[PDB]
From a paper:
Structural analysis of the GTP- and GDP-bound states of the Sulfolobus acidocaldarius GPN enzyme (SaGPN) showed that this central GPN-loop GTPase adopts two distinct quaternary structures. The dimer interface emerges alongside the surface of helices α3, α5, α8, and α11, whereby α8 contributes substantially to the dimeric assembly due to its central position allowing the formation of a hydrophobic pocket.
The GDP-bound structure contains three molecules per a.s.u., where monomers A and C form together a physiological dimer. Likewise, monomer B forms a dimer with its crystal mate B′. The difference between both SaGPN dimers in this crystal form is minor, as a superposition of the dimers yields an r.m.s.d value of only 0.24 Å (445 Cα atoms). In monomers A and B, a double hydrogen bond between N70 of the GPN motif with Q106′ is formed, whereas altered χ2 angles of N70′ and Q106 of monomers C and A, respectively, are consistent only with the formation of a single H-bond. However, due to the loss of the γ-phosphate interaction, the GPN loop detaches from the nucleotide, resulting in an opened substrate pocket around the phosphates. Additionally, the γ-phosphate-GPN interaction is lost after hydrolysis, resulting in a swivel-off motion of the GPN-loop including the preceding α2 skids (residues V58-Y65), thus relaxing the whole assembly. After GTP hydrolysis and loss of the γ-phosphate, the substrate pocket switches from a closed into an open state by losing the interaction to the second protomer’s GPN motif.
Residue numbers in the entry:
A (entry chain C): 1 to 240
B (entry chain A): 0 to 240
The structure:
Amino acid sequence: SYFIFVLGTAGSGKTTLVKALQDYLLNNELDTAIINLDPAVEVLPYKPDIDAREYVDVYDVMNKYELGPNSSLVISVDLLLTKAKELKEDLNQLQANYVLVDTPGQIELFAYRDTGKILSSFISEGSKSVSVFLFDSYLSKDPKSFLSLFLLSSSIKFRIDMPQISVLSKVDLLSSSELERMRSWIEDGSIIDELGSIDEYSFELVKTIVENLESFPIPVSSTNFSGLDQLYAEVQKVLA
Amino acid sequence: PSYFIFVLGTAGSGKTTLVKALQDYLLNNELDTAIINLDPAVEVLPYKPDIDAREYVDVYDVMNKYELGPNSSLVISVDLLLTKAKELKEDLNQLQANYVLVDTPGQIELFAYRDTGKILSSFISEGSKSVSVFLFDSYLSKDPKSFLSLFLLSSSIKFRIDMPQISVLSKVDLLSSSELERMRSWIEDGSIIDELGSIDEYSFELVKTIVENLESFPIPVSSTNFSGLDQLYAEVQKVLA
Ligand SMILES: Nc1nc2c(ncn2[C@@H]2O[C@H](COP(=O)(O)OP(=O)(O)O)[C@@H](O)[C@H]2O)c(=O)[nH]1
Ligand SMILES: Nc1nc2c(ncn2[C@@H]2O[C@H](COP(=O)(O)OP(=O)(O)O)[C@@H](O)[C@H]2O)c(=O)[nH]1
Ligand SMILES: [Mg+2]
Ligand SMILES: [Mg+2]
């Protein structure tokens, strides 16, 4: 069994990539299941084999405790730890070599809460796991926001202790010219010239990123169905 | 002379409680401070806000008007504050205070990594100096790897919210004196390198850059013990000068 964890900011394309990656993998004759760990997602574009909404009803939490949407979201994600026993039980009943794991919409509720570390380590126990972090192309158009995503993706890795592949998601929102500037920003280091006013600390952080980064984030577009061959190949290399 | 203090941090790291404690410290020193709450989904507030986002955007109205769930409604509700920005500054100018405490939404992601955050933060503090305060949750900081993840997160937020940022170690009453001293030596002396296990070269070079270039340890503050607020305000003043 192989576990692929899809991470990223809200609306960065996690859920859509899970459906698009599943279609690519099933088209290439690999049986993949999907676990949805978002107990508050309204509409899913795929058929999840395990649905967190079947374990924790965020609407039940709202009125049982008389809390608002924000508190209920935090409480609902935390309740997944109490339902982890059933989660791993339903894992063994699925027989697939690859398992895609869709995470809650807000990565903060997953990575920076103990539920994230425990659940991800508990369900991938005895299996190989890899995480995929989505760089929102819309956020990456600005060089400072682009660099903030690199620091964010590095932060998540320190919380979720598993290898992480970087993906530039929703890349169809970019022109060929926009990608070339973003590519040269990191591959050459020209983002230094277009960085505005920085403190020495943050400037030293950017220096470390550009000079020590091994590869650019994989440009993927779930709607154009592009980059999934590169993403799958990078997943394979990590899993070896 | 109006000063805006934006309080940031992970969910449950103590932003709202610190806003009350900071207001209490400033009022004890006879400094007229107002509070803006920008969280449209908070149930109970421990302070009395001069501007409340819940009076401009009703998150429950958004839920059934749009027929969406809590997650989507939260995102839309935070975004709707931009439609109410005209009214927002109108009620702000009615305040004459030297310090304006800004309480942000519970999830820092909904604020920092959404375009609403910078626009709101830049719009209401127009014509004034602003400083940001990022809360390091002490409970998360007990683990050396999670501690470092907070340093990378706080640095990421600074690249999104373009204003000076003061780092605070919040909820420090959850730590023993020994735990706090170990966390200080972890970063100030670099001994955290030894307590990192085996990590990739990229992450290791990032840790090195943090330890060797960090200017100061985060200010240990405890809102429940009402400690460290003298250090925070002094650092706020030094930045605002
Ligand atoms: N252009 C483009 N839009 C996308 C892509 N993937 C997702 N989206 C859109 O982005 C919005 C949010 O995506 P979603 O899958 O919900 O991201 P999530 O919240 O992280 O799970 C949806 O309305 C999608 O239509 C993509 O590859 N390209
Ligand atoms: N022990 C301790 N608990 C705190 C402190 N500040 C806040 N809390 C608790 O942390 C929880 C979340 O605090 P809150 O201010 O709402 O966090 P926020 O989401 O960032 O606004 C609350 O239950 C508080 O009681 C503190 O200084 N010490
Ligand atoms: Mg989703
Ligand atoms: Mg709060």
